[PDB]
């Protein structure tokens, strides 16, 4: 059964980029939208939008630069079978700072850089580069 919707979102992006899809759609959730917001603000995806009400669908517009997909890697870190939490000092650097780690903190989902500047740890959702 479906036991990790976030890993599914990341995979839809990974597989979408590898297949040169313009957009990818999926069942929405508040956490998926929170992650989509971070990906947009850091410039990994172009745009997102939620459509529906009873069964909302999240669409992500993927971005390509010089033919190549911009999301070169995207990996689930914390997962249902093994949750991963880090203190502020132990927050991971992705690609020596050139990538992002998405972190769920008590002040919402944000990048590792924003968590570190806010002085927060949290759950490491995924690495993006």
């Amino acid at each position: 059964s479906m036991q990790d919707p976030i890993a599914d979102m990341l995979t839809r992006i990974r597989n979408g980029q590898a297949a040169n899809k313009a957009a990818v759609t999926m069942p929405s959730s508040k956490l998926k939208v929170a992650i989509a917001n971070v990906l947009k603000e850091e410039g990994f995806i172009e745009d997102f939008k939620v459509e529906g009400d009873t069964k909302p669908e999240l669409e992500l517009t993927l971005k390509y630069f010089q033919g190549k997909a911009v999301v070169e890697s995207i990996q689930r870190v914390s997962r249902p079978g093994l949750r991963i939490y880090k203190r502020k000092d132990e927050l991971p650097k992705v690609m020596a700072g050139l990538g992002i780690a998405v972190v769920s903190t008590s002040k919402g989902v944000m990048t590792d850089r924003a968590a570190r500047q806010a002085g927060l740890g949290g759950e490491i959702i995924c690495y993006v580069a």
Partner: protein, 154 residues
């Protein structure tokens, strides 16, 4: 271009009469400034094999975005059974790598690096894994470019 001979190997094919020995030569060439290529040459004599390898190496060179004679970030490279890891190091570290990886990194112009070869250490595949690792390494500028940000934002 600096040129380095990594490995020479005697190979054999059988014929009606007996065995026909020949030689293979694996070489790397580089400008010492983020340009590197490898060549693999085969001939009945060792010096002919090396010459063929060096000619191949000069025409199959790729560009690597260096930083101060070290890498931009930790990189993984894979080819066949060879899996390599390479990490940026501080000045005065030197090339902390095995011989095949060392030859590549030296001619490429990487002075400081920590490396490790996992899986098969077969030179032919280690060199391909290493160059594969280097060529897909991102600089901050191209990251900034693809993400549509400034480098200070990155």
């Amino acid at each position: 271009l600096q040129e380095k001979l990594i490995a020479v190997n005697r190979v054999s094919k059988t014929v009606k009469g007996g065995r026909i020995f020949s030689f293979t030569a694996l070489t790397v060439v580089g400008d010492g400034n983020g340009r590197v290529g490898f060549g693999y040459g085969k001939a009945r004599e060792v010096p002919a094999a090396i010459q063929k390898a060096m000619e191949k190496a000069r025409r199959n060179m790729i560009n690597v975005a260096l930083n101060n004679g070290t890498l931009q970030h930790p990189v993984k490279g894979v080819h066949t059974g060879s899996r390599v890891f390479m990490q940026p190091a501080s000045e005065g570290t030197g090339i902390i790598a095995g011989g095949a990886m060392r030859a590549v990194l030296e001619v490429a112009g990487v002075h400081n690096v920590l490396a490790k070869a996992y899986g098969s250490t077969n030179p032919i595949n280690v060199v391909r894994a290493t160059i594969d690792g280097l060529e897909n390494m991102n600089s901050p500028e191209m990251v900034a470019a693809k993400r549509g940000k400034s480098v200070e934002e990155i």
